[PDB]
Design a protein around this ligand. Structure first.
Ligand SMILES: [Ca+2]
Ligand SMILES: [Ca+2]
Length: 312
């Protein structure tokens, strides 16, 4: 498989478990530090990074009834400048730029206790697809589906339902939505980390997925596997392969990667394009740091970059 070796430029440092890179509607850049702990208990953080200086500001250190969060992944909303954050202890949070936040769900649409979440992806219809590799949210004792298949997938819909849409994954992690050129969502891709697979479904409608399939194969026998992912503007899927020192690039039909991108570190965890550029910001756990590099083309627009009131 062809491998390219772009120049990685350091962005910021010392972010425990650096994850969830995201740009808001003002172009501000955020990351989460899920692994910050106080007295051995979770005290994860959501940070804003000043791209000019690399200086970090913690805007939110979420805790619910004394249970601190493990915020792990993010998406920016479209209609309001607020971040939806998947948290391994707290489930799904909505966080404002002022640092205030709310916890969205203690239970799902069927009254089942909510599971801790890892990453999420808005489709263009505004529905939010979320991976949930942890067990029940706080105050339940923390567990994760790395050994046993209890990880779930949710769709948090525009009408505010938190719908469990699949179950029994061994650590579902990255997630992405592919759209038709006319903007209709039609495929969901979900990383199952340790099994070295990417799974696909057909999106039939809000919270409606069918035709589960093993869509892609992640290279390697290292400990780790697919972590975060995102599409570029031609619908190639770029996937951080934690432990492999590469980001894998899959073409629109999946299968094996068509190209790999060598990183100067073994553990890329997640990535995000900066809007209107070819720049991909990458979080990684070898150094607990953030970097950026130039890809071959622009990212596929995120939901936050689209317009509610477009004409075209
Ligand atoms: Ca992740
Ligand atoms: Ca991303």
């Amino acid at each position: 498989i062809p491998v390219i070796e772009p120049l990685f430029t350091k962005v910021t440092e010392d972010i425990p478990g650096a994850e969830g890179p995201v740009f808001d509607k003002n172009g501000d850049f955020y990351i989460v530090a899920p692994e910050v702990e106080v007295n051995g208990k979770p005290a994860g953080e959501i940070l804003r990074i000043d791209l000019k200086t690399g200086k970090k500001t913690v805007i939110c250190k979420p805790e619910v009834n004394g249970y601190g969060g493990i915020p792990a992944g993010c998406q920016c909303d479209r209609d309001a400048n607020q971040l939806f954050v998947a948290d391994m202890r707290l489930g799904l949070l909505v966080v404002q730029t002022d640092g205030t936040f709310e916890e969205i769900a203690k239970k799902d649409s069927e009254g089942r206790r909510m599971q801790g979440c890892n990453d999420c992806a808005f489709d263009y219809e505004g529905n939010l697809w979320i991976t949930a590799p942890a067990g029940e949210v706080a105050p339940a004792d923390y567990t994760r589906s790395m050994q046993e298949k209890f990880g779930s997938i949710y769709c948090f819909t525009t009408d505010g339902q938190m719908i469990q849409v699949d179950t029994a994954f061994q650590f579902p992690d990255g997630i992405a939505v592919r759209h038709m050129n006319d903007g209709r969502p039609y495929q969901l891709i979900v990383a199952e980390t340790p099994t070295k697979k990417l799974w696909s479904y057909d999106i039939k409608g809000p919270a409606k997925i069918e035709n589960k399939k093993v869509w892609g194969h992640i290279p390697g026998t290292h400990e780790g596997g697919a972590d975060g992912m995102d599409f570029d503007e031609d619908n190639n899927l770029l996937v951080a392969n934690w432990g492999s020192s590469h980001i894998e690039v899959f073409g629109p039909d999946g299968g094996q990667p068509k190209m790999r991108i060598r990183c100067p570190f073994e553990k890329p965890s997640n990535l995000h394009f900066k809007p209107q550029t070819k720049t991909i910001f990458v979080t990684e756990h070898e150094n607990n740091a953030v970097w950026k590099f130039e890809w071959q083309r622009n990212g596929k627009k995120q939901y936050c970059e689209t317009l509610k009131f477009g004409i075209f």
